[PDB]
Amino acid sequence: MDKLLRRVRMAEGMVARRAQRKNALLKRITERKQNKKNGEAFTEAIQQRKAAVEARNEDWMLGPLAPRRELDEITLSNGNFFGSLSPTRALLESEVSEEERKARVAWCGSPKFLCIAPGDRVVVIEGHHKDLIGTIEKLNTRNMTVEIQSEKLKTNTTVPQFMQNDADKPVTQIYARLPISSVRLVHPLKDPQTGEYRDVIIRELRPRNIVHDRPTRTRSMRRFVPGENIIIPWPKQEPIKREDQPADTLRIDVDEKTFVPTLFRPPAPQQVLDELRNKYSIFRTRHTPEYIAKKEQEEQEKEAKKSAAKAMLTPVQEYNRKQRELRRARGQPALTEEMLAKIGEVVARNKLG
Amino acid sequence: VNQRMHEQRHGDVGNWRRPKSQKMMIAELAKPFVWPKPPAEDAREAFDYAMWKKQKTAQEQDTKFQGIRAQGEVVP
Amino acid sequence: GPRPTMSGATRLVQKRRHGFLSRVKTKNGQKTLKRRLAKGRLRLSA
Amino acid sequence: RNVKQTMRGIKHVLTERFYAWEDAVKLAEQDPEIDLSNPENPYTPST
Amino acid sequence: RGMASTKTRYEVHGSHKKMSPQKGTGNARRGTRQSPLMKGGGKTFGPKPRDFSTKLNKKVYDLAWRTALSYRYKRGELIVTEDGLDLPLPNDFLWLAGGGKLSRELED
Amino acid sequence: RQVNLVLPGQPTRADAPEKIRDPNYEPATSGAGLQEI
Amino acid sequence: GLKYRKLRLTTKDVNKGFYKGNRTGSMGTHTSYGTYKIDYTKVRTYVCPDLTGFKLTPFVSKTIRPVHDQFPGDKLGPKNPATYLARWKSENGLD
RNA sequence: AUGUAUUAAGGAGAGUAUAACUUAAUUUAUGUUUAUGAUAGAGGUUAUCAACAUAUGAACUCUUAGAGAAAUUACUUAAUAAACGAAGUGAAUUGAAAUAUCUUAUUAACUUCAGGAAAAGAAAUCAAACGAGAUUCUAUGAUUAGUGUGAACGAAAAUAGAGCAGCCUAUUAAAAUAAGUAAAAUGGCUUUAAAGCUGUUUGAAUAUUGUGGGGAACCUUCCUCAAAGGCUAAAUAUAAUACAUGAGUUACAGAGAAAAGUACCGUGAGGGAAAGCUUUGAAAUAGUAGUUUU
Numbered sequence A: 001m002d003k004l005l006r007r008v009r010m011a012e013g014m015v016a017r018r019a020q021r022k023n024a025l026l027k028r029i030t031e032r033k034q035n036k037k038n039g040e041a042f043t044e045a046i047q048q049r050k051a052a053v054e055a056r057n058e059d060w061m062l063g064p065l066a067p068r069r070e071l072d073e074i075t076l077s078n079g080n081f082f083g084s085l086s087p088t089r090a091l092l093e094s095e096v097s098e099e100e101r102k103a104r105v106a107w108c109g110s111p112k113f114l115c116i117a118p119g120d121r122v123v124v125i126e127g128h129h130k131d132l133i134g135t136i137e138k139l140n141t142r143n144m145t146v147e148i149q150s151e152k153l154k155t156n157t158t159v160p161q162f163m164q165n166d167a168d169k170p171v172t173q174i175y176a177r178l179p180i181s182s183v184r185l186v187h188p189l190k191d192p193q194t195g196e197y198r199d200v201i202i203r204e205l206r207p208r209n210i211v212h213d214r215p216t217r218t219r220s221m222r223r224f225v226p227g228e229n230i231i232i233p234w235p236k237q238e239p240i241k242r243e244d245q246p247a248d249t250l251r252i253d254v255d256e257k258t259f260v261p262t263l264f265r266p267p268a269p270q271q272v273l274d275e276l277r278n279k280y281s282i283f284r285t286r287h288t289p290e291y292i293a294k295k296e297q298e299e300q301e302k303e304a305k306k307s308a309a310k311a312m313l314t315p316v317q318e319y320n321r322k323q324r325e326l327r328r329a330r331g332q333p334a335l336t337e338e339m340l341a342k343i344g345e346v347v348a349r350n351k352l353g
Numbered sequence B: 001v002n003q004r005m006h007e008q009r010h011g012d013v014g015n016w017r018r019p020k021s022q023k024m025m026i027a028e029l030a031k032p033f034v035w036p037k038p039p040a041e042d043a044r045e046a047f048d049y050a051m052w053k054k055q056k057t058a059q060e061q062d063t064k065f066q067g068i069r070a071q072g073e074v075v076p
Numbered sequence C: 001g002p003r004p005t006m007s008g009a010t011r012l013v014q015k016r017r018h019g020f021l022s023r024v025k026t027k028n029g030q031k032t033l034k035r036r037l038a039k040g041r042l043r044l045s046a
Numbered sequence D: 001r002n003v004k005q006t007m008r009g010i011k012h013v014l015t016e017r018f019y020a021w022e023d024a025v026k027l028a029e030q031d032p033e034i035d036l037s038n039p040e041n042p043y044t045p046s047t
Numbered sequence E: 001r002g003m004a005s006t007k008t009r010y011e012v013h014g015s016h017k018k019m020s021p022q023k024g025t026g027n028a029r030r031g032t033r034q035s036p037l038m039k040g041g042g043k044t045f046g047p048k049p050r051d052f053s054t055k056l057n058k059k060v061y062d063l064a065w066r067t068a069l070s071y072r073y074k075r076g077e078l079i080v081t082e083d084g085l086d087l088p089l090p091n092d093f094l095w096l097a098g099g100g101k102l103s104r105e106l107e108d
Numbered sequence F: 001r002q003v004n005l006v007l008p009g010q011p012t013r014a015d016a017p018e019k020i021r022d023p024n025y026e027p028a029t030s031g032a033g034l035q036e037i
Numbered sequence G: 001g002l003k004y005r006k007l008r009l010t011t012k013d014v015n016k017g018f019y020k021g022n023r024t025g026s027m028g029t030h031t032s033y034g035t036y037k038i039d040y041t042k043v044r045t046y047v048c049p050d051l052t053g054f055k056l057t058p059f060v061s062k063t064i065r066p067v068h069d070q071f072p073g074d075k076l077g078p079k080n081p082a083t084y085l086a087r088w089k090s091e092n093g094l095d
Numbered sequence H: 001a002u003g004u005a006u007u008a009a010g011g012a013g014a015g016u017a018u019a020a021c022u023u024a025a026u027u028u029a030u031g032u033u034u035a036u037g038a039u040a041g042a043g044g045u046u047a048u049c050a051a052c053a054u055a056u057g058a059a060c061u062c063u064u065a066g067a068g069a070a071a072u073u074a075c076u077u078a079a080u081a082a083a084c085g086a087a088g089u090g091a092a093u094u095g096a097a098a099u100a101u102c103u104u105a106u107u108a109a110c111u112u113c114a115g116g117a118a119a120a121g122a123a124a125u126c127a128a129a130c131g132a133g134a135u136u137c138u139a140u141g142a143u144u145a146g147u148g149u150g151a152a153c154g155a156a157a158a159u160a161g162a163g164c165a166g167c168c169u170a171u172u173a174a175a176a177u178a179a180g181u182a183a184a185a186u187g188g189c190u191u192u193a194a195a196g197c198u199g200u201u202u203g204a205a206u207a208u209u210g211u212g213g214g215g216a217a218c219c220u221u222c223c224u225c226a227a228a229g230g231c232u233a234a235a236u237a238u239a240a241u242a243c244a245u246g247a248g249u250u251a252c253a254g255a256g257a258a259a260a261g262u263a264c265c266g267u268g269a270g271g272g273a274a275a276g277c278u279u280u281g282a283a284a285u286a287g288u289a290g291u292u293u294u
């Protein structure tokens, strides 16, 4: 029925309008909680920048009386030792906004078409350890941070005591991670003039020859250097090792085909259909003929109730209506070409002469 | 039926609601069934109990301090 | 001054006076509901 | 979560078969190669 | 644009009940909560959406147009040319840009 | 027709670092002095 | 009474004839002297099949990659009543 | 805030992969283009490394069968807020420097009825001796004509703009052209005394071959229209959504609400918050240090 569809369409809109008001309110609460969690990483960096503004003025003034700040107690504001970062600030695990991930990856594709992979050497272009070269070990695609296992990027970090034994030293040196924007790709190219291979820094990458596979939900693309069109091969990545566990079904059983369609008996007991869907849901679109027949007779019982006063009409009321039907069948007369030609003469005679 | 504490939609903010109560049933078996005894704390290494304990004590001490602050007090 | 006018109060009289069914089922109670509903109230009654 | 995805898939294929069979019956009523009246031999391969 | 707007004490949300009794509390007698003297009260003479445009005689507006056109004429800053005043961009670039060989980044 | 503007040529495949067998080649340890492209 | 009075009333709060169920279903009818007669036509049973020898488990090995179905060129690929009736003829003609 | 476009029933309870929303709470397929896009790898939870378009599975309880202390009982393929619109009833604060007529005011409010709009509508209309040609919305006409002791109240013709549409054979099915009607007396309403609405008592005529209405007391000539039967989109009202613009706000501002009709207060109707960020750190206030006085 056409009136039963409006009922469903109206229900689908009422629920989607309520899911948006709830989702919006949750997007604002989750955002307000992360911003307050990231702010603790911004505060530690702000407190250490000012601590360095005062530590340098004392080394200048005191001279031979310079304190031994490495033997001091922790800072109760953040709980860090001297000259040590915090795990949240040394691993760069603080979530970043979506407009940041696109900025960090702006130089190498996009957050969903990233053109750098683990296993390819990069060069640092920011921070204290500029112009350093190392190989990418990990690639955190959530914060768009990269780990380079170089001994120069190590940094003291304070280990929280809830994950540390009582004999373990409180501070340890871990490999610090960098954002994707702070590193560029290094790949050896061939000198077209002399044919000698030398290393160069790739300033920009973009995806090429993208092709998706819908059945498998996979894709395969190529990365090239814009301006010069140098297709750079991907680095050797080892696929994850997939194994067969004892709890998993054997390959011979998962492939067995046992379904045989039927036409005179349902695929399953007819009672099961009441469990798969709700018989009385306002979102039901597949109705039975007996139901639609009962729904269409609600209007048929109104057109017969609106026109129920046609049995109380007087003879003159019935005569008028009966004539009206006959007249509407005559139609409108038409003007023949002969009549049109005679009208054109009148127009031309009264306009031009 | 076991009732659940009334709470606020967002922990410390929101309207006051009440979660769905819990139903427990005790069946009188015709054949006895006896549970095994829990493993000794020193024999729970398969579940990483050592690390789990350190983390549990940390949260226990942060929940206790946040209760000392709820009384309007601080640790000298 | 104010008096302890809610001492000995029962929650059965609270549902019979300011309950939801006391309002949907009366012409004057349907107005209170729509007003609180149009204002945004979560607690339309009781 | 993985056990709940198999339980959801079972309910999707069963709902798909009920509706597919409920339509094949209608589509099989207007077919000249199927005689739903007699169940003993309701199909005859067309020549 | 002139669309700035502000709420007066007659537009601010809330009830128009009297805040504190006329006398008895000892504090300054207060009326409604939307008074400018209250925290969230309305701005009395605040901005409102209105029309800022003024009028200028067509003759005075035309004299000002030919006076700015003569101020440039006497200083030599009015350089009239022939019709078809377009930048004579090279033909090669126009042939490549129209063809579509050149990307936007290079075309711009 | 030939033009006076040089446009990027057709793409070329750069040899992977493992496949390079040139004896007179050594990876760069420091990024200073390397050409940026 | 200030605040608890405003929460939703439950059966664990009042006792003066206030009853409220948990939607457990009607399993019978009430008698005139306060008893209950269980109508076993309304009582529900659970049909659990024999699981001895069943080889399928709720997991599939991760070696076998997840693949969907193509149904090329057929908008209503998996729901096409024609590919369900035509497929029926070849495989099972009798039933 | 305004404008444009589109749309025409809203809320709550509980549960759930805490960007993902309904006990299936991250369903399943199509087509196209994929860096010359659009605006020759790794990766199924170490996931959703793909957008657009079109389909598609599922979508609980209450409001909302009956009863009841809404979210329960008991049954079942039971189901529609507010504002806006028309009619009925109809104040008071206020002004007149008091106050009765008057003004506030065909107002607020309530009541019924109806729709995405409603109402109104193709002249028993206005004009003035020339003519205009339905209704609705905006401005001018107009602190005007006029009314009223006064205070104040207040048209129409016409003009311009937005829209434009005419008909009864109504593009949805209606008239055999309208009688207890027009009108009169009387009591009220509206109002300028006309026209219009109305309770009570009474009560006409039949077309320009000059019958009937109107043209602001009233009569007459002339002009003009044709009541007592009907249909009709648009421009207009409100709400929601999206977008555009800004000598709009930038956190005691903007809105009541940057997590809000929430916390909280009230038996209840009802009243109704505070709270941004990692930046800067004023004044008051407090404890000390240096110089100085006591």
Ligand SMILES: [K+]
Binding pocket: none
């Ligand atoms: K007077």
Ligand SMILES: [K+]
Binding pocket: none
């Ligand atoms: K006057």
Ligand SMILES: [K+]
Binding pocket: none
């Ligand atoms: K009159």
Ligand SMILES: [K+]
Binding pocket: none
């Ligand atoms: K505010």
Ligand SMILES: [K+]
Binding pocket: none
């Ligand atoms: K200060």
Ligand SMILES: [Mg+2]
Binding pocket: A218, A219, A220, H041
């Ligand atoms: Mg691949």
Ligand SMILES: [Mg+2]
Binding pocket: A275, A276, A277, A278, H024
């Ligand atoms: Mg279900």
Ligand SMILES: [Mg+2]
Binding pocket: A283, A284, A285
């Ligand atoms: Mg459905």
Ligand SMILES: [Mg+2]
Binding pocket: C001
């Ligand atoms: Mg008293």
Ligand SMILES: [Mg+2]
Binding pocket: C007, C008, C009
């Ligand atoms: Mg008492």
Ligand SMILES: [Mg+2]
Binding pocket: E016, E017
């Ligand atoms: Mg008042």
Ligand SMILES: [Mg+2]
Binding pocket: E007, E012, E040, E041, E042
């Ligand atoms: Mg304000």
Ligand SMILES: [Mg+2]
Binding pocket: E054
């Ligand atoms: Mg000016």
Ligand SMILES: [Mg+2]
Binding pocket: G012, G013, G014
């Ligand atoms: Mg109790």
Ligand SMILES: [Mg+2]
Binding pocket: G013, G014, G015
């Ligand atoms: Mg008790």
Ligand SMILES: [Mg+2]
Binding pocket: G017
């Ligand atoms: Mg009872």
